[PDB]
């Protein structure tokens, strides 16, 4: 095994990754959904500014 | 229909996303008389005709078993 497994696994699993994760897209969407202070206070400032 | 244990309403909603905006000649049926619910409205060479849903999806479902005829093949008849 020390030859057989390691020849592949040491060599290739060296370089594992690159992506702009779709899971991070999920995170971004969620944080947008759950920036309460952003949505609510923007909406309230926008409306409440107009007084007639 | 292989999505199980769920309701034609689900597809209703999938209609409403999928076609109801997109597909011009198909329509949400207007109100009309004679019927509790009608769900589809589309346009035909005969003119334009409108039709309705009971949950029946499974009726088209085809089960199979080898076994049934498999053994009947043994049988006397």
């Amino acid at each position: 095994x020390x030859x057989y497994x390691x020849x592949x696994x040491x060599x290739x699993x060296x370089x594992x990754x690159x992506x702009x994760x779709x899971x991070x897209x999920x995170x971004x969407x969620x944080x947008x959904x759950x920036x309460x202070x952003x949505y609510x206070x923007x909406x309230x400032x926008x409306x409440x500014x107009x007084x007639x | 229909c292989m999505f199980p244990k769920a309701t034609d309403t689900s597809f209703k909603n999938k209609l409403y996303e999928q076609h109801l905006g997109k597909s011009n000649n198909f329509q949400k049926p207007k109100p009309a008389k004679g019927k509790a619910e009608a769900h589809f409205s589309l346009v035909h060479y005969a003119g334009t005709v409108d039709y309705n849903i009971i949950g029946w999806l499974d009726k088209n479902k085809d089960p199979l078993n080898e076994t049934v005829v498999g053994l009947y093949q043994k049988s006397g008849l």
Binding site: X22, X23, X26, X30, X33, X34, X36, Y39, X40, X43, X44, X47, X48, X50, X51, X52 | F3, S10, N13, K14, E17
Partner: protein, 371 residues
Amino acid sequence: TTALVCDNGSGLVKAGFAGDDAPRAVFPSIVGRPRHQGVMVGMGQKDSYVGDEAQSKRGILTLKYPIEHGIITNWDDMEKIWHHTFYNELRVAPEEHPTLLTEAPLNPKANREKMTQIMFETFNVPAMYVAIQAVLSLYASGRTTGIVLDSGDGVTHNVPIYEGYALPHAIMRLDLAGRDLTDYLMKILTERGYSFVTTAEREIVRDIKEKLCYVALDFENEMATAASSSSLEKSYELPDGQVITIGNERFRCPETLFQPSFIGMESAGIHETTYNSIMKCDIDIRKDLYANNVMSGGTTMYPGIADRMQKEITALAPSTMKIKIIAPPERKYSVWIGGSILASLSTFQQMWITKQEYDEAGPSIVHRKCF
């Protein structure tokens, strides 16, 4: 044709034609959306969910709450809710009826202007009205004078109404409603330290608020009983999962109304606010109000409030004069019921807004035309 009323008093939302005894059905005004990657490809993705549908679906949904402090937070969400309610429950088209709107008093014009703007434009609806809670409360309770306390899901009220007129100076308006109390509850609950914070987890408390609460008769004496006894303590299940068993933590909660230290503010409380607001109002009327004292909705549901209230007034009143309070059974529905009555009388035909005005003048129309 026929006439239809929306209740948008917060909490579950109430809608029904004039002359039915009770609204057809009622919805929390929860709004909620997905939290996780959608991984059944078979599933249709719907990105927003509301009502008992959501109440079932909750767990991966997460909640937004479109009314803070009686102020409705995000309009388009409301529009979603509203559309759903009409079509799904009501099977109703905007043309079909005049529609009547239910408002916190003394709150920013914007809710008036956008609400009307949307509902005349987005919906197109024969006649519109927005009405202040207390008026309905009187009509249902049927005493032309009065003072009302109704602390719903949302901002909590004192209005004296005299027969046929408003005293808008008299009026007191408070953000003390049960939701914020409930969120204080958790800061209690960690004492026993079964502990969870998220929106749905917070609504789970609502059930306990139904079941487990009752009003302190006397605070000191209750503490003495708390030292003596466990009958004060009752055993309750998770909606699913564990049995949970709760001490003084039940009764301590309502006292916040009497003492909003526990989440800390100064306004000297329901009762002292009330007597204050009385002492603002003039001298002769007062006896009537001492007689006519009226309460409703979300907090009032608790057993016993009226009694300690009376104890408080007997503290503050000159004992010499009669005192009583009204505690009807139906208080939580009261508003929409009164709205039905309000809908009934032909005078609103004189009174409704019509599309024509909305054509010829803006949202500005309302603020003259309505209270």
